[PDB]
Scaffold this active site. Structure first.
Site, PDB file in Angstrom:
ATOM      1  N   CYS A   1      -0.113  12.626  47.104  1.00  0.00           N
ATOM      2  CA  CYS A   1       1.232  12.367  47.704  1.00  0.00           C
ATOM      3  C   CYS A   1       2.218  13.456  47.284  1.00  0.00           C
ATOM      4  CB  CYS A   1       1.630  10.926  47.495  1.00  0.00           C
ATOM      5  SG  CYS A   1       3.255  10.431  47.966  1.00  0.00           S
TER       6      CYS A   1
ATOM      7  N   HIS B   1       1.596  14.605  50.625  1.00  0.00           N
ATOM      8  CA  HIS B   1       2.324  13.830  51.613  1.00  0.00           C
ATOM      9  C   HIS B   1       2.991  14.812  52.570  1.00  0.00           C
ATOM     10  CE1 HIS B   1       5.155  11.138  53.523  1.00  0.00           C
ATOM     11  NE2 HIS B   1       4.311  10.194  53.129  1.00  0.00           N
TER      12      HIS B   1
END
Lengths: 187, 187
Positions: A105, A125
């Site tokens: 992420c 992400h």
């Protein structure tokens, strides 16, 4: 003998990205240490779930080496990881010793901060791409999980199972990953 | 005004099935109370993740009503839920008042224990089917998420995002569920 994982838990970590890897790795028979960056006090995650670490990072870092070091995401958790000298040292030693580093992420942006794995193909992400790519030190991927040598990255809460199972495969093999996966009821 | 969720957390709960719904519901702007069945002390989940509840169940049950009551799974967590008189009362009141009840994995077996929602179409973890179906009081489904009126069930860790998003849709609507889903990087 079992493989060992260090999961570094900072305030603002994404709790799903913390718990899914911890749980899946323990299902795989990995010895997992949830280490609190700031000490062994409870950690307030990004969505206010409060997790009690197994140990402080200060203590856990003395009990290595670990077969994998795992960096959860969450924007503010990753910022804390990125600002930590202890994390810098841990990651540099892990890279030197050719141990796996796994980040999800926003977590991979701590690799940038600590100058780890430059040249690797990575994902993050989508919202963390620009931060990760500042200076062009990595090559970007949109794959849900990316692995370039000992640098294993992934994108978000919804890729956390795939990320965790990729760690299991890297450490304990394909058969164990498949055995762990089946009871999870994944698509 | 915001919708409110009660998540009942017992020793042995599946931590992924606890954290994914809590986090996703909070992303949806739901006010979530993580209530410790046994009190406000930290709870040791099935894979040894330790979660600090927001409140004891004893306290939280006085601060209702809740728009949803959520029962995580994990075999031993569900057993604790199934054995609790407080849980029985909460679920019976929720059903009487036509509020949503959401249970995942082994969690639906607490519905059986407490005589909740008989006749409903339900799913469970595959390994929990026989327990759920003892006496034939429910009709079984293999769908990843099943919803029959106010009884919302799901299968396992790997269906937890779908379960959580189904709760969000039921409470806050399809548009909010879609908005919450997109940043998760789900398939």
């Amino acid at each position: 003998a079992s493989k060992r994982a260090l999961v570094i838990l900072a305030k603002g970590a994404e709790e799903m990205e913390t718990v899914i890897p911890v749980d899946v790795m323990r299902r795989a028979g990995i010895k997992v240490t949830v280490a609190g960056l700031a000490g062994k006090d409870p950690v307030q995650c990004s969505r206010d779930v409060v997790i009690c670490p197994d140990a402080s990072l200060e203590d856990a870092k003395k009990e290595g080496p670990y077969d994998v070091v795992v960096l959860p995401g969450g924007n503010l958790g990753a910022q804390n990881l990125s600002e930590s000298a202890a994390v810098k040292e841990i990651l540099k030693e892990q890279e030197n010793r050719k141990g796996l580093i796994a980040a999800i992420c926003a977590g991979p942006t701590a690799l940038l901060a600590h100058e780890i794995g430059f040249g690797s193909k990575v994902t993050t992400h989508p919202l963390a791409k620009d931060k990760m790519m500042n200076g062009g030190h990595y090559t970007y991927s949109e794959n849900r999980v990316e692995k370039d040598g000992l640098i294993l990255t992934s994108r978000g809460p919804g890729t956390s199972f795939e990320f965790a199972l990729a760690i299991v495969e890297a450490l304990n093999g394909k058969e164990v990953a498949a055995q762990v996966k089946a009871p999870l009821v994944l698509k």
